[PDB]
Design a protein around this ligand. Structure first.
Ligand SMILES: Cc1cc2c(cc1C)N(C[C@H](O)[C@H](O)[C@H](O)COP(=O)(O)O)c1[nH]c(=O)[nH]c(=O)c1N2
Ligand SMILES: Cc1cc2c(cc1C)N(C[C@H](O)[C@H](O)[C@H](O)COP(=O)(O)O)c1[nH]c(=O)[nH]c(=O)c1N2
Ligand SMILES: O=c1ccc2ccc(O)cc2o1
Ligand SMILES: O=c1ccc2ccc(O)cc2o1
Lengths: 360, 360
């Protein structure tokens, strides 16, 4: 099975091609993770996936999505990850982390607590920042503050500090969150970036925040550990071909700047879109980016059956298959997939205290 | 669905009728549990089951099955359970524990490391104890030492101390392990008990160790928390009707001595048997014990599909359905069962950070 072939990137070898993508848990307190995250992540790692990427972890307090988001904006925050990293490694999975800044989509309620911008008089809320003072709209109506050049310098340094902390906590894989309408994505998109300084207007200027952040992170992140990013390559906003062409050009510049793999997603920059959700719907677009930028990729949003996953790999659409919600339903999804694909000794996807009893 | 109806026993209410039975992990070191057990148990509790019973936990070092077995023979051992108990309660499951003594089946290898008695020159092994100096046979050829009256008094006190420690660690449900050919079961069976003192020969004498241990434990275990036992009610050894009649009589004496629920199992006292393994095969025998002893019961050994479980409850064969291996395969089996039985808001079997995303 392609799904169960190992994958090597830089000095890191994954035991199979199943990746667990970052999935916010909304269970942290002032950015500090706790036993929710410890058990959640260690349990997933034991389930058999080759790579486990920790949820969007804010580089600064105002870059959380919600009051429940994880953070890594101080050394105390980073140290809270150390036992979890150690538990993920003990299970034989590779520990990764997504470092993030929510931009204009920050200061929101948890998804089961309204999913909307926090009310102005709620003591939990805060001012958001963005390239330009323009609201997302819909359920996120708060107008963000337009960043100064000093804000841009500060947030870049926060990404550097976050990467340094992730390194020193023992993570073996990092992902810069430049997708999903958050700060990085919003610098790239003309919908959200109306700046007329060096960080807006032209393709080079809109790209600048992302490329400078990548380069700054590259200075502290070890050259022997994968350096990756998530990026929304189209919006489904009626501008898809032009947007995909620019996104591919940016992917080429990421590769030239030391990016080892790109997680290909949708932008979610604005609400007025028509995303054609369906099984493996991102496969052809991931494949195009992989081919035209000559860069390894993963994607998600509907690959969560063993057959979809296997087919995407065999077609060389993807290098790793990210499987999210299926792992919330069943932390041992990788074992389920091994059985379904007829892998020999499928139960030994799991550790011995489970595998011995499940051998059929 | 019957499976998702709550159950109250003494002061404890279970949120549904799914019980996770004790399942040895073989991951402890000198009896001390560790992050293997913490993550395993907390993850299971979050999966939705109403009751989670911790694995056979030895009341004395020589009562471990293997060098990897959990123990509760000192206060330090008990304190290691406190954070796990607290994590199980945080998830809304009821924490229970099975306290045990392996008798002549002790000093064995882990099941994936030979599953047999430890060799005489292996530094890990130890002398076993039993009612009579008679080996199990087959892969367990070691002849145990015949217990003195002082040994009987000591082991009873070890069960009392273990129950006191379990109470003080915060467990809300206790199970005395009088099944599976271990010490208690071996006192009851004429195959293994050839004593001619007060603890062998007659039904009353063979019962005596079990009834005295129950009574001694009852003195320290709170009257408002369920007091339960696991007991092998037949062997499939060609003596089934007579054995089941005696077992039912003992179950009546357990009920009169304060037992709240009986986990009905097979004896596994000797190797030369013909157990008719099959789906829900224990259902009719559990039902007979329930009816003839007028005592709530659970059982296991093949009820691990949502339909088998539901049918057993609706037929009043069982009060709780124990589901073991299916939970090793999928820690979220209770969610799977809720979906399969068409329970409303099935995803909310799981905590919010999973349930919100799985609502279909
Ligand atoms: C609970 C939860 C939380 C998050 C997510 C999703 C879900 C379900 N997703 C998106 C996620 O990584 C993935 O792309 C989607 O779940 C689609 O893949 P599946 O169809 O679920 O396999 C997400 N994406 C990301 O880049 N950072 C994150 O922290 C989050 N948070
Ligand atoms: C890994 C593992 C370990 C154990 C068990 C089994 C397995 C699979 N079983 C028996 C268990 O509680 C249950 O009766 C069986 O698993 C049968 O139920 P299922 O068919 O698996 O649902 C078991 N029984 C018990 O009374 N004490 C224990 O600690 C153990 N240990
Ligand atoms: O990047 C993110 C963070 C949270 C999140 C939550 C839900 C979803 O569908 C996507 C998401 O992306
Ligand atoms: O009571 C026990 C302990 C370990 C154990 C292991 C396997 C099994 O099938 C049953 C068992 O019963």
């Amino acid at each position: 099975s392609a799904l169960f072939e190992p994958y090597t990137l830089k000095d890191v070898t994954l035991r199979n091609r199943i990746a667990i993508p970052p999935m916010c848990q909304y269970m942290a307190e002032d950015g500090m993770i706790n036993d929710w995250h410890h058990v959640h992540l260690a349990g997933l790692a034991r389930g058999g996936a080759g790579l486990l990427v920790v949820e969007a972890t804010a580089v600064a307090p105002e870059g959380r999505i919600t009051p429940g988001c994880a953070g890594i904006w101080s050394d105390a925050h980073a140290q809270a990850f150390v036992p979890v990293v150690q538990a993920i490694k003990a299970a034989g999975s590779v520990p990764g982390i997504q470092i993030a800044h929510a931009g204009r989509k920050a200061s929101a309620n948890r998804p089961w607590e309204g999913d909307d911008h926090i009310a102005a008089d709620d003591t939990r809320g805060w001012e958001t920042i963005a390239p330009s003072a323009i609201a997302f709209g819909a359920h996120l109506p708060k107008v963000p503050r337009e960043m100064t050049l000093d804000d841009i310098a500060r947030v870049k340094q926060d990404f550097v500090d976050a990467a340094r902390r992730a390194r020193d906590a023992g993570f073996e894989w990092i992902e810069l969150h430049f997708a999903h309408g958050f700060l990085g994505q919003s610098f790239f998109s003309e919908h959200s970036n109306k700046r007329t300084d060096a960080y807006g207007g032209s393709f080079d200027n809109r790209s600048r925040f992302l490329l400078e952040t990548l380069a700054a992170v590259r200075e502290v992140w070890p050259e022997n550990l994968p350096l990756t990013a998530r990026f929304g390559v189209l919006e489904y906003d009626g501008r898809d071909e032009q947007t995909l062409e620019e996104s591919i050009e940016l992917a080429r510049r990421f590769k030239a700047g030391g990016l080892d793999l790109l997680s290909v997603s949708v932008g979610f920059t604005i609400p007025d879109t028509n995303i054609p959700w369906g099984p493996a719907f991102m496969g052809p677009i991931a494949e195009r980016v992989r081919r035209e930028a000559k860069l390894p990729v993963t994607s998600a949003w509907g690959f969560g059956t063993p057959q979809l996953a296997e087919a995407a790999l065999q077609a060389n659409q993807l290098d790793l298959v990210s499987v999210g919600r299926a792992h919330l339903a069943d932390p041992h999804w990788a074992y389920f997939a091994a059985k379904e694909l007829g892998v020999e000794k499928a139960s030994w996807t799991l550790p011995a205290p489970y595998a011995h009893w499940l051998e059929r």
